[PDB]
Each structure stands twice: as C-alpha cells, then as structure tokens.
Design a binder for this molecule. Structure first.
Ligand SMILES: CNC(=O)[C@H](Cc1ccccc1)NC(=O)[C@H](CC(C)C)[C@H](CSc1cccs1)C(=O)NO
Ligand SMILES: [Ca+2]
Ligand SMILES: [Ca+2]
Ligand SMILES: [Ca+2]
Ligand SMILES: [Zn+2]
Ligand SMILES: [Zn+2]
Length: 158
C-alpha cells in the first residue's frame, strides 16, 4: 500500500511524556528513526515548528482517532501509514510508563515498531520480527531488525 514518495522526511515531537527526561525522549525517537534510515534511502529530520510528516504524540484514552487507548497495558502505541495529515503519525499511550531501559515499556523499541507503520509496514506473524504485534524487551546489545523486517522495508523502499 501507501509509501512516502520522497526521500527527506520530517518528524516532530508534539509533547513529552513526564515519565522520562526530555533529552532521553529525543534520543530514543532519533535512534528509532536511525534504525530505518540505516536500511533505506530515507533521511529523517526533527523540526520544532510547523507541520511535520510524522507527528509523535503522547496521549491517553480517547485522543481524536478510532484507536482510543485503553489505560495501562494492552495497547502501547499505534501509528498511521504514509499519507497527508494524520498519515504517518505515531501515538504513544501515556498510561504506560515509558523508559530508556527494561523497566516499564521501552520507548525506543516501541518507536521502532511504530515508525515501521509510519513508513508503510504492516504486522508480521513471525515472533522474531520487530513488526510482530506483541512488545518484547531486548537490550541494545541484542536488538536488530529481523530478515522479515528487512525484506518488508526494502520491498517498499530502496
Ligand atoms: C504489552 N502490550 C503489548 O505487547 C501489546 C499486546 C497486544 C497485542 C495485540 C493487540 C493489542 C495488544 N502490543 C502492542 O501494544 C503493539 C505495539 C508493540 C509491538 C510495541 C500494538 C498493538 S495495537 C501495535 O501493534 N501497534 O502498532
Ligand atoms: Ca502526518
Ligand atoms: Ca495502553
Ligand atoms: Ca506515563
Ligand atoms: Zn491515536
Ligand atoms: Zn503494530
């Protein structure tokens, strides 16, 4: 389905979770975009004003779409495929406790998955894939895209 038809993509962090230090939110999101720029021709840039392609939002409960969040647990985040307006945007449930580590829900790992959707990927049935729909903590020692994820993204880009 839909893909970005340009190589320079922008993102903006709409608001910041109080669960984390501001700089750690910025870094987690930046690093998550890097995972995907490493395996595609895409370039990602953070902007702080105006309309970005991919808006990163922390929100809880009903927050303006059909994908209302459900309090702590269950659904952690959701994202829209490429397109105008809400297309591309990535939403993170503030009722989770976001972190840089194994405690709570790791923001970086969740953002890698969400951004996969923001770039046009669907879910994988392979539990080893980052696009599998259940969160799995892995350290940034073992984390890597799986073959399934790589094939998926290169079938869309590059
Ligand atoms: C502790 N919670 C979870 O591991 C839930 C479990 C779950 C599975 C299926 C349906 C609902 C919840 N997984 C998610 O939150 C998904 C995001 C994860 C992979 C980072 C989320 C499901 S919607 C999603 O794929 N967004 O794009
Ligand atoms: Ca958008
Ligand atoms: Ca939730
Ligand atoms: Ca929170
Ligand atoms: Zn949403
Ligand atoms: Zn998903």
């Amino acid at each position: 389905g839909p893909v970005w038809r340009k190589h320079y993509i922008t993102y903006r962090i709409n608001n910041y979770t109080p669960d984390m230090n501001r700089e750690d939110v910025d870094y987690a999101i930046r690093k998550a975009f890097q995972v995907w720029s490493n395996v595609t021709p895409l370039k990602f840039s953070k902007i702080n004003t105006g309309m970005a392609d991919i808006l990163v939002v922390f929100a809880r409960g009903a927050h303006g779409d059909f994908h209302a969040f459900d309090g702590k647990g269950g659904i952690l985040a959701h994202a829209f495929g490429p397109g105008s307006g809400i297309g591309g945007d990535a939403h993170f449930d503030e009722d989770e406790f976001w972190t840089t580590h194994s405690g709570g829900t790791n923001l970086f790992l969740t953002a890698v998955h969400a951004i996969g959707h923001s770039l046009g990927l669907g879910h994988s049935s392979d539990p080893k894939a980052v696009m599998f729909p259940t969160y799995k903590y892995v350290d940034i020692n073992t984390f890597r895209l799986s073959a399934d994820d790589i094939r998926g993204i290169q079938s869309l880009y590059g």
